[PDB]
Structure 1
Amino acid sequence: TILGRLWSPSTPKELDPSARLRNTNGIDQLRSNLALFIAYQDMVKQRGRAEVIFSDEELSSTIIPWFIEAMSEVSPFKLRPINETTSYIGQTSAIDHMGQPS
């Protein structure tokens, strides 16, 4: 949610990732994978969409990402390039001379 709070708009709470942002400089990667996002939604349903960016674990400075799997490699989760994330799939289609398909 913190991060949530970064994708924004527009959440100028702190004026968005901010003062807390300034502790950071590791932030950088987190985001950068799609996979990463994916959890969020889970919260949305789950937590009904929780509240207050989890209290930031109260600023836990720079240390809890560093408990992640990318910083505590527990699961297969494979940083994998998007393109190759799969590809056994090709597309195929109809058309009536449409030329679109249907």
Structure 2
Amino acid sequence: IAYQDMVKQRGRAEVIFSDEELSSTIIPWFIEAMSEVSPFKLRPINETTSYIGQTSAIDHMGQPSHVVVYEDWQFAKEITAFTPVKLANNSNQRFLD
């Protein structure tokens, strides 16, 4: 999908041409860059859609009249309420009571 995004905006794809070698030896670290630091951490495609359900309405035979895709979500538990306290002026440092 990222390729699609890129090619939409760029309209071309150009290379540093340091390959065939360079980016094969240096870097896979594109992988390392992706592995540790990022919040996007790598998952099996099985375990990504675990929260999604799907349900069809129907007619007599039947083909669906109404089809609804959803994410199973849980509400609550609490709603937090606080008063911020500034320890030093000009800064965002705060205790939140």
TM-score (ref. length: structure 1) = 0.49
RMSD (CA atoms): 1.9
* Pairing 1:56–2:56 present: no
Which runs of at least 4 in structure 1 moved beyond 2 Å after TM superposition?
55-59
Structure 1 segments unaligned to the other structure (5+ residues): 1-37
Identical counterparts, % of pairs: 82
Which structure is higher in RCO with an 8 Å CA cutoff and minimum separation 6? 1
* Structure-2 separation of matches of 1:85 and 1:57: 35
* Pairing 1:43–2:6 present: yes
Q: Deviations over 1:47-73 (max 9, x none)?
A: 11324xx1333441411222x2x3132
Letter in 2 for 1:95: I
Question: In the alignment, which residue of structure 1 is the partner of 2:48?
Answer: 85
Classify 1:85/1:56 alpha carbon distance in 2 versus 1 (closer, same or farther; 3 Å): farther
Asked which structure has the greater CA Rg, the reply is: 2
Query: Larger helix proportion, structure 1 or 2?
Result: 1
Structure 2 segments unaligned to the other structure (5+ residues): 66-97
Query: Larger strand proportion, structure 1 or 2?
Result: 2
TM-score (ref. length: structure 2) = 0.51
* Structure-1 separation of matches of 2:2 and 2:11: 13
